[PDB]
Structure formats: C-alpha cells, structure tokens
Amino acid sequence: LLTPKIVIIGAGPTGLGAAVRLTELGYKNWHLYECNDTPGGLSRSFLDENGFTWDLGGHVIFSHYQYFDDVMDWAVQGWNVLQRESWVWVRGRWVPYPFQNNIHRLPEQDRKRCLDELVRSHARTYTEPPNNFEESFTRQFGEGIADIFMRPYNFKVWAVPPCLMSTEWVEERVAPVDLERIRRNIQENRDDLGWGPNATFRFPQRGGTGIIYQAIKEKLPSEKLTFNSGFQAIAIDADAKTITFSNGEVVSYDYLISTVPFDNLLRMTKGTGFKGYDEWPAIADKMVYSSTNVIGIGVKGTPPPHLKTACWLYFPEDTSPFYRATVFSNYSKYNVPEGHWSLMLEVSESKYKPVNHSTLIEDCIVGCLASNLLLPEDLLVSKWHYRIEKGYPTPFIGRNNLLEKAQPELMSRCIYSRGRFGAWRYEVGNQDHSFMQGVEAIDHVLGLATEETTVANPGRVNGTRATTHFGLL
Ligand SMILES: Cc1cc2nc3c(=O)[nH]c(=O)nc-3n(C[C@H](O)[C@H](O)[C@H](O)COP(=O)(O)OP(=O)(O)OC[C@H]3O[C@@H](n4cnc5c(N)ncnc54)[C@H](O)[C@@H]3O)c2cc1C
C-alpha cells in the first residue's frame, strides 16, 4: 500500500530487465504489459514448419555487464561460446573484419589505392572536426577505403546517407587504423584480427537468443504479466497517470517504464504543464530510423568449405540487396533439422531506400548466387521473410538535442522512456544495454541509484565492464 505502483510497457529485453530487477528485489507492486504473445521483442525467435529456428537477424550475446551475464546463466543452461569469424565480400575477395584494418586482402590495385589514399588523407589536416559521419570516415580512412567500403556499406545498412549521421556513436563500432601496422600487414600478409566487443560471443544451444526471454518470462510471477493483443498501449494521460489500451482497459501507474518507440510515446502522451509540449509532434517526426527486413533461407546439406566456420558476412557491393548474411546454423546445430544448414539475410529499408517486398525473397536468392553464398544446385527449404518497422534507431545529426528537449520532461512526470527505440540511442542499443537500461531505470525509480549510466553516458559503460552481481543466480 505504501510502495509506488510501477508499470512496464513492453516485454523486450529492456522491459524484462526492469521486471527482473524488481523480482530480484522482491518488489511486489508492479505489472508488465505486452501486446505480442511472445516475450523478447526484437530479440524473439521463431520455429518454422520444417524445424528451422529463426530470429530477427541472427542475434549473438556479448555482455558489457557482470549482472547481465549472471542473468544469462540463470535463465539458460547450455550455451555455446564462439570466436567471431566475420568477413567482408568485396572486390571478389573475403576480407577479414574490420575491412579498414585488413586492406592487404584486397586485390593489388585496390589495396594500393586504399593505402595511397590513406597516406594522402593522413597528409591533410583541418581547422574544425568533421560535421558528420561521412566527413569523419573520409578524413579518417581516406578516399580509397571510403569509396570501396565505408560509403556504400554504410548506406546499405543504415538506409540513410551517412552525411546525415552524427559521429559520436562510433566508439565500439568503427575501428581505427594505424598506417605503420597496415604497411607491415601488407609486407607480411598478416591479418589484423580480434577487434571489438563481439570478438567473442555466446549463443544458446536451443531456441536462439529468444529462448532467453521465454525462460525469463517463465521465472517471473505469472499474474504480474499480461501478454495480449488487447493490451497495446494507445494513450498515456500524464496528469491522470493512466494508460489506455486498445481493448479499452484503463490502468493507473505511479511510475511508467515505457519501452515503446520514443516517437510513438510522444504522439500518444497527453498532459498539462509539460515544457515544450506543443513541439512534441515535430520532434516525433524528426526521429530518424530504418526498417529491417529479415530473410531466412533453409538449405539442404552442409555449407561450402569457405563458410564452414563463418559467423556473419558483410556485403558493400550492389550485387546483393542484403547488407549482412549470417550462417545461423553455425551458431548451433539444433538451429536446423538434420542434414541442413541456414542463412539469415538482412535488408534495410527507408524513404531513402525503398524495398519491393513482392520480389524481396527472390532478389536475396539472386544476391546469394552472385555473392558466393549459394550455388545454382542448392536446394532451398523454409524460405521466410519478416519486416520490422523500427529496426535501427539512426544516430542522426541533432538526435541528442531532440531527446534532451523531451526526455527530462517525461522523467519529471514519472515516465521513463528506455530501450533501443525507447531511448533511441544506437550506441547502447544491444540486448545487454537494453536489459540494463531497464534494470537501471528501476534502481533510479526506487532511489537505489542516483544515475542511469547506460542511457545517459554510453562512453562509460562501453569502456569498462560493470562488476556487480545478480542475486538470483
Ligand atoms: C537486425 C537486428 C539485429 C540485432 N542483432 C543484435 C545482436 O547480435 N546482439 C544484441 O545484443 N542485440 C542485437 N539487436 C538489438 C536487440 O534487438 C535490442 O537490443 C533489443 O531487442 C531491444 O530491446 P527493447 O526491449 O528496448 O525493445 P524491443 O526489443 O523492440 O522490445 C519492445 C517491446 O515493446 C512492445 N511494445 C511496443 N509498443 C507497445 C505498445 N504500444 N503497447 C504494448 N507493448 C508494446 C513490443 O511488442 C516489444 O515486444 C539487433 C536488432 C536488430 C533489429
């Protein structure tokens, strides 16, 4: 009776993060609402008619937090730990990831060009920092690496011209180069391997990453969770402190942990005394994102020799519509029926880059044949396609300024908008980040913590590993 009623909207990792922290604390006065039947949001998994396990782009787990690792161990027994083997298909070669560090694997002419332009851009200095991502990577890597990889690959994944993107999200995503190391790589044909936070990752033996959140759902108190299409939140009244759902039910909260898209939130949230309130519709309109198409191809037999131990593959060239392919069957044999393997292809989509959905599956197959993934004789089963409206929250120029206009106003009225699209911060938009934003929001609501470091300070969380444990393990 004395504790605040905490309501969580969304059973993705962020929402489930909040629910797990509350459960760990033995907190009783909360409830979680989800409009889908399945927990896990963008990290959910599917099982098809033919025994193929699929998900939304071949998710792998790589945690920045001891807490989240403990939760993984608690929720799921039976993990595979893999060494990342990732490649770029470009100029007819398999270039080890990251592209920019491994230009010695390009054909001679392209390698020379890449090296020469890197030397050239090193020779050019500038009074002001780059104003955008394209200016940044062009100055940093030179015109060779920009033209061959950065420019075409980035438009291909983001579906937004990179000159419209900010430059501060890149810390753990875009690897730097060192001219001396590259020259030596070229003399020795020495691959530069191991860079990045996912150089090692873990993957559940059965059920994909989505089994994590299905297991978590099972471990939480059933009467505190609602999974039902009628419980899609469609209006928030911040004065009354109520949520109205599509089925017409109205419920109260003292605190709201919202994980719905930030633009959706702004559009459906009413109240008085919000500073800047009448700007909210224009703010919502300015939030840039790409949609994501996932295509699953089930294949009879076993992968060809070059893909035997591959994880994921990058495709900058226009001979394929997908920016990435994942050999999902290499993450776990239980992902496919006996005697098969599988590819998962991702194709980005936006107003800048429209997609013809009626030909999408066939176009991907043509892409696979032209990109060394499939052969004409391959026998395909379980062709599958799924489209996600909000796939990547683009780190567009001005993003922070926009978030700063409204987020503090929402928080002052006990509304915490968190998660991949809840907070719209790509650089802390993976599963561990999201889950932890949920955990940290709960700590902040309950006064157990002064700050929410993940959502507020991406530099700090991605530079250190958080040490603190999860009690239930
Ligand atoms: C192609 C792709 C590949 C990815 N790969 C990786 C990876 O390899 N590793 C990794 O760690 N992360 C990966 N991610 C990121 C991962 O998907 C997210 O970090 C995570 O799913 C975000 O969780 P979230 O709960 O903040 O949002 P979501 O996961 O989208 O969860 C939000 C939930 O809210 C619900 N909801 C929305 N609106 C309402 C409403 N109005 N009413 C009621 N419920 C609502 C939704 O149904 C959903 O279930 C990938 C993402 C994509 C798109």
Ligand SMILES: O=c1ccn([C@@H]2O[C@H](COP(=O)(O)OP(=O)(O)O)[C@@H](O)[C@H]2O)c(=O)[nH]1
């Ligand atoms: O060889 C590479 C591959 C990717 N990237 C950059 O790293 C970013 C993140 O890509 P990744 O596959 O790591 O993240 P994801 O798309 O899965 O979120 C991309 O946008 C690229 O700009 C890069 O610099 N070199």
